[PDB]
A paper describes a structure:
Viral entry is mediated by the [name]-1 envelope ([name]) glycoprotein trimer, a type 1 fusion machine comprised of three gp120 subunits and three noncovalently linked gp41 subunits, which binds to cell-surface receptors and fuses viral and host cell membranes. Entry inhibitors targeting the gp120 subunit have been developed, with a promising small-molecule lead, fostemsavir, the prodrug version of [name]-626529 (temsavir) currently in phase III clinical trials. We engineer crystallization chaperones to identify a crystal lattice suitable for determining high-resolution structures of inhibitors, spanning a range of >6000-fold neutralization potency, in complex with envelope trimers of clade A and B [name]-1 strains. We report here the engineering of a protein crystal composed of a highly glycosylated trimer and two crystallization chaperones, which were adapted antibody fragments.
We next sought to determine cocrystal structures of Envs from [name]-1 strains [name] and BG505 with [name]-386150, a compound similar to the prototypic [name]-378806, though with a bromine modification to aid structure determination. Although there were differences in the three major binding fragments (colored in cyan, magenta and green respectively, as defined in Fig. 3b) interacting with [name]-386150, the interacting residues were mostly conserved between [name] and BG505 Envs. Indeed, a modest but significant shift of the β20−β21 hairpin loop was observed in the [name]-386150-complexed structures of [name] and BG505 Envs, supporting the idea that conformational changes around the binding pocket, instead of the sequence identity of residues of the binding pocket, dictate the clade-dependent neutralization potency of this class of entry inhibitors. Interestingly, we observed conformational differences in the interaction of [name]-386150 with [name] trimers from clade A BG505 and clade B [name] [name]-1 strains, despite conservation of all [name] residues that contacted [name]-386150. Differences between these interactions related to the positioning and orientation of contact residues, which differed despite being identical in sequence. Specifically, we observed the BG505 and [name] [name] trimers to adopt slightly different conformations in their respective binding pockets around the β20−β21 hairpin loop region. This difference in binding pocket conformation led to different conserved residues interacting with the inhibitor, manifested as clade dependency in neutralization assays. The crystal structures of [name]-386150 also provided a basis for its reduced potency, as the bromine substitution, despite being beneficial for structure determination, abrogated the hydrophobic interactions between I424, M426 and M434 and the methoxy functional group that was replaced.
Numbering used by the authors:
A (entry chain L): 6 to 67, 67A, 67B, 67C, 68 to 95, 95A, 95B, 95C, ...
B (entry chain G): 129 to 135, 153 to 184, 189 to 309, 312 to 321, 321A, 322 to 354, 357 to 365, 368 to 397, ...
C (entry chain H): 1 to 82, 82A, 82B, 82C, 83 to 100, 100A, 100B, 100C, ...
Write the structure that this text describes.
């Protein structure tokens, strides 16, 4: 399925309209699916909800035909960022094996925090194993978008470095890794190594030397 | 016609000449299965039988009180006797210039919106001992009937000639449902019992009700809102009498209603927009008798 | 109440039967409907099929010719067996309890209703990777700190395929733990890194050991961390 973008503000009220309106009497399901995580049944019967869902998750019923299905989320929070699926069941259309298209909710204007960069030197074991690795760790930044810069002493590297795409956390901030694979002699022949993490418009530096 | 289905009425398409005689369009519309026959390609039921004229979409089928008057110098004679069977001499005679308000309810099997009787229910026939003679029953208390076509159909105008506009059924908005009726199980039970009463005053034995022996005769056919229903009335007469609950029948619908003379012409009842639901009083009944029962 | 937990190979070769299972907790297996749902990267949720309390089969026609959702009521276990798998089948597989609703809009006797299904409780998810590449165990290399507060962790280097689990002190140390997402290196192997923020007082000496687990390799390793 393809994605349908949406942007509400923190504390506002989302109005996610279904993308496959009903032809007859409907029984529409809403699922909160966070990517790579168990979906959450939001609303099963056109308006009924399960046990353990906040009252702010309201689904429109189909008393009088014509009123389309819209999921309403009043007082949006940060954790409400996810996917939302409209499972449509009406008398006319057949069997709905397919869930909704998708509607990714991105809450705007959230508290911007800065990363906590932590760089570890190559381990003793792997150094003896004839391989190096610098692990520049980044966590708890928002919005989740950072650029990693590696400096061999004063010169950039760009060669032999991997970096994770920013992923979300439990506290709704982001986190990502950055591995630089050196040869055990390159790691020693150099005086120092740094890691520049440029989050938003500020770069942070965490350097390490071979002592 | 190139007809599909829906889930019953077909979904057809057909090339038709337009307001310009040499330009062709392909229109689509719905036709109840009864209004079409296979030749899959389809056609209209009558094309090998008779000419068909669409009823003007402004004339109504409303049963109106028609008062029949005799000319000056003539007379119409009434019979006020509250138990007068079919024929014989009436002792409570009166003369009238015109009959009462008569409603030309063209019905079948169940008489609708008719004149009730006073006192008890009467039953009429010619030679009741002759089975090839219909029995016209008259109730003394109407039993409510409620019919409806819940489908929210639409009406599409098709220009197939200069000023000749054929009205077809566009499609169905919302739920696809069933044309049917309703009567009270209790009221039709006590009323069936009343009819059982005087089926003994002219008989003995046990009374059995059973289903009817083109579909116009086999079902309670009538007009509701302007469309002709054909309610399978088997849920009405399937009970044997020695000595909440709504009865609902399965009504089909037709748009082409042929005539009853001998191979002439037919009619097309134009579609009615929106939903249809009428309420009537079944006040009469036409029976037919056929061992030990 | 009722919870679910799947358990699959995690890696299956092309043109093979992607078997799987799912045991339920605290609920009878033969009085509910059970559905299976997968979700690949880049695609949305996809409804595999579902088995009834009557053991009735009904699969998504998209892949209907491939699936077969069985169930054995001796336990609360029911399996799912896809076959002739391909790369496009790599997805997280979930195990949810479906329930049957009857949406009546007209007369129940004429047939004017339809049956809709809704999943209310879900499993956790079994990642599955399809690739001819063989399985690989990782290798843990400790990460030591260097002094109020300080941080230390374990580098889980070059494993395949996702995922690995990392506890601390067998599960005792759970505050401040922060395992990071993996890194698919160009060599075709993933790379993880856990890290725990720890009081500087406990540096000497509150023993710390990271418990690494990689199911597709039958491997369970530990490693101390110290300056
Ligand atoms: C001629 O004669 C004909 C034949 O005699 C006669 O036919 C009748 O036609 C009418 C209309 O044409 C039909 O009326 C419809 O009836 C439907 C069925 O309603 C019954 O069932 C529901 C659901 O029952 C389940 O759930 C309840 C609790 O919710 C349980 O207690 C039940 O045990 C049952 O659960 C078991 O069974 C399920 C199977 O369904 C299993 O899945 C389940 O696991 C369990 O085993 C009941 O709620 C109804 O109760 C109502 O009636 C009782 C009296 O019995 C009253 O006390 C009270 O008024 C109750 O409300 C009933 O028992 C209805 O679904 C339908 O109404 C809905 O649909 C229309 C359009 O389709 C909507 O406009 C309408 O608003 C309703 O939608 C609501 O409900 C749906 C589904 O729940 C929601 O999705 C929707 O969002 C909407 O919710 C809103 O309203 C709800 C209240 O309704 C509210 O709860 C919500 O919060 C929200 O606000 C319609 O009424 C009738 O069935 C025909 N009769 C027969 C025998 O077929 C005809 O009338 C005669 N006359 C003519 C033709 O002129
Ligand atoms: C009946 O069939 C016609 C086709 O002859 C349908 O009209 C098409 O409907 C589809 C969507 O279902 C549209 O994409 C097309 O553009 C329509 N074509 C025309 C010429 O209108 C019609 O929807 C069908 N209706 C029913 C009730 O079955
Ligand atoms: C029997 O009489 C009733 C009452 O006159 C008819 O119901 C009317 O139906 C027409 C069109 O269907 C409506 O315009 C009127 O408003 C209705 N009247 C009422 C009071 O509801 C009914 O159609 C008649 N039945 C038959 C078979 O002719
Ligand atoms: C209308 O005529 C054209 C002529 O080519 C034909 O292809 C088409 O099938 C006709 N339509 C129908 C409904 O038969
Ligand atoms: C017309 O065709 C129908 C086929 O449905 C047939 O039953 C009927 O007898 C035919 N009538 C004439 C006059 O040919
Ligand atoms: C005649 O019939 C009318 C009505 O049926 C009634 O009111 C009247 O009393 C009757 N008169 C006689 C003499 O029977
Ligand atoms: C149907 O019911 C009663 C007669 O018993 C009356 O109120 C109503 O007018 C009747 N409708 C008719 C006769 O059309
Ligand atoms: C009506 O009553 C007369 C006698 O009053 C009788 O001759 C006649 O047969 C009766 N009609 C029927 C149909 O029984
Ligand atoms: C009535 O019909 C029977 C045969 O069905 C016949 O014997 C009898 O003579 C008829 N009676 C009258 C009055 O016509
Ligand atoms: C019938 O359908 C029309 C749309 O053509 C809509 O405006 C109207 O509200 C519907 N009525 C009912 C009773 O469904
Ligand atoms: C028919 O409908 C009328 C008016 O809606 C109602 O008063 C009556 O009780 C109904 N009777 C039946 C048998 O449905
Ligand atoms: C109704 O007629 C059918 C057709 O012969 C017969 O089998 C059935 O027994 C009859 N029912 C009653 C109640 O007489
Ligand atoms: C009328 O309905 C009964 C069942 O209610 C069915 O057996 C019968 O075939 C129906 N009659 C017709 C003419 O379809
Ligand atoms: C006659 O048909 C009615 C339909 O309402 C049904 O309730 C009744 O059981 C039937 N009689 C039988 C099966 O003897
Ligand atoms: C019978 O039909 C009337 C018509 O509206 C409806 O109000 C009533 O609830 C129905 N009763 C049953 C038992 O279906």
């Amino acid at each position: 399925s393809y994605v349908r973008p949406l942007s509400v503000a923190l504390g506002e009220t989302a109005s996610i309209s279904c993308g496959r309106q009903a032809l007859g009497s409907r029984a529409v399901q809403w699922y909160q699916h966070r990517p790579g995580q168990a979906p959450i049944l939001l609303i099963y019967n056109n308006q009924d909800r399960p046990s353990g869902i906040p009252e702010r998750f309201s689904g429109t019923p189909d008393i009088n035909f014509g009123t389309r299905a819209t999921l309403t989320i009043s007082g949006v929070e940060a954790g409400d960022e996810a996917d939302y699926y409209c499972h449509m069941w009406d008398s006319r259309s057949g069997f709905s094996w397919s869930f909704g298209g998708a509607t990714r909710l991105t809450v705007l204007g959230q508290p911007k925090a800065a990363p906590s960069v932590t760089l570890f030197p190559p381990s003793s074991e792997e150094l003896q194993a004839n391989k190096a690795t610098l692990v520049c760790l980044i966590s708890d930044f928002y919005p989740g978008a950072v650029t990693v810069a590696w400096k061999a002493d004063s010169s950039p590297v760009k060669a032999g470095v991997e970096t994770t795409t920013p992923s979300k956390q439990s506290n709704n901030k982001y986190a990502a890794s950055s591995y630089l694979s050196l040869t055990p002699m390159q790691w020693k022949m150099h005086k120092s190594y740094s890691c520049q993490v440029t989050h938003e418009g500020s770069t942070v530096e965490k350097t390490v030397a071979p002592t | 016609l190139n007809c599909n289905n829906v889930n019953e009425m077909k979904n057809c398409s057909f090339n038709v000449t337009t307001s310009i005689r040499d330009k062709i369009k392909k229109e689509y519309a719905l036709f109840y299965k009864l209004d079409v026959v296979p030749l899959t390609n389809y056609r209209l039921i009558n094309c090998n039988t008779s000419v068909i004229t669409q009823a003007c979409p402004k004339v109504s089928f409303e049963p109106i009180p028609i008062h029949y008057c005799a000319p000056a110098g003539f007379a119409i004679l009434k019979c006020n006797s509250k138990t007068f069977n079919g024929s014989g001499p009436c002792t409570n005679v009166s003369t009238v210039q015109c009959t009462h308000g008569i409603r030309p309810v063209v019905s079948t099997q169940l008489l609708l919106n008719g004149s009730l009787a006073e006192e008890e229910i009467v039953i009429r026939s010619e030679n009741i001992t002759d089975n090839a003679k219909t029995i016209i029953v008259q109730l003394n208390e109407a039993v409510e009937i409620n019919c409806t076509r819940p489908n929210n159909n639409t009406r599409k105008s098709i220009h197939i000639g200069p000023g000749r506009a054929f009205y077809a059924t566009g499609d169905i908005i919302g739920n696809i449902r069933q044309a049917h009726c309703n009567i009270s199980k209790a009221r039709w039970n006590e009323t069936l019992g009343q009819i059982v009463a005087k089926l003994e005053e002219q008989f003995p034995k046990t009374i059995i009700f059973n289903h009817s022996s083109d579909p116009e005769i086999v079902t309670h056919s009538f007009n509701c809102g302007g469309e002709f229903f054909y309610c399978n009335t088997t849920p009405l007469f399937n009970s044997t009498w020695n000595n909440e609950q709504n009865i609902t029948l399965q009504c089909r619908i037709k748009q082409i209603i042929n005539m009853w003379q001998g191979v002439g012409k037919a009619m097309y009842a134009p579609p009615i927009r929106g939903q249809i639901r009428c309420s009537s009083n079944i006040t009469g009944l036409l029976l037919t008798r056929d061992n030990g029962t | 109440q009722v919870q679910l937990q799947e358990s699959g190979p995690g890696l299956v070769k092309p043109s093979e039967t992607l078997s799987l299972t799912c045991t339920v907790s605290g609920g009878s297996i033969s009085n509910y409907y059970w559905s299976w749902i997968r979700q690949s990267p880049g695609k949305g949720l996809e409804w595999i099929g579902y088995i009834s309390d009557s053991e009735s089969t009904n699969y998504n026609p998209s892949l209907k010719s491939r699936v077969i959702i069985s169930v054995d009521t001796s336990k609360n276990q029911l399996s799912l067996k896809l076959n002739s798998v391909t790369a496009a089948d790599s997805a997280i597989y979930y195990c949810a309890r479906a329930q049957q609703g009857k949406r009546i809009y007209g007369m129940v006797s004429f047939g004017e209703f339809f049956y809709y299904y809704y999943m209310d409780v879900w499993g956790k998810g079994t990642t599955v990777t399809v690739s001819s590449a063989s399985t690989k165990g990782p290798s843990v290399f400790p990460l030591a700190p260097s002094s109020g507060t300080a941080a230390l962790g374990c580098l889980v280097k070059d494993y395949f395929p996702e995922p690995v689990t990392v506890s601390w002190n067998s599960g005792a140390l759970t505050s401040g733990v922060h395992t990071f997402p993996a890194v698919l290196q160009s060599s075709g192997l993933y790379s993880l890194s856990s890290v725990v923020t720890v009081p500087s007082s406990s540096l000497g000496t509150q023993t710390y050991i990271c418990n690494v687990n990689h199911k597709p390799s039958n491997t369970k390793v530990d490693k101390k961390v110290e300056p």
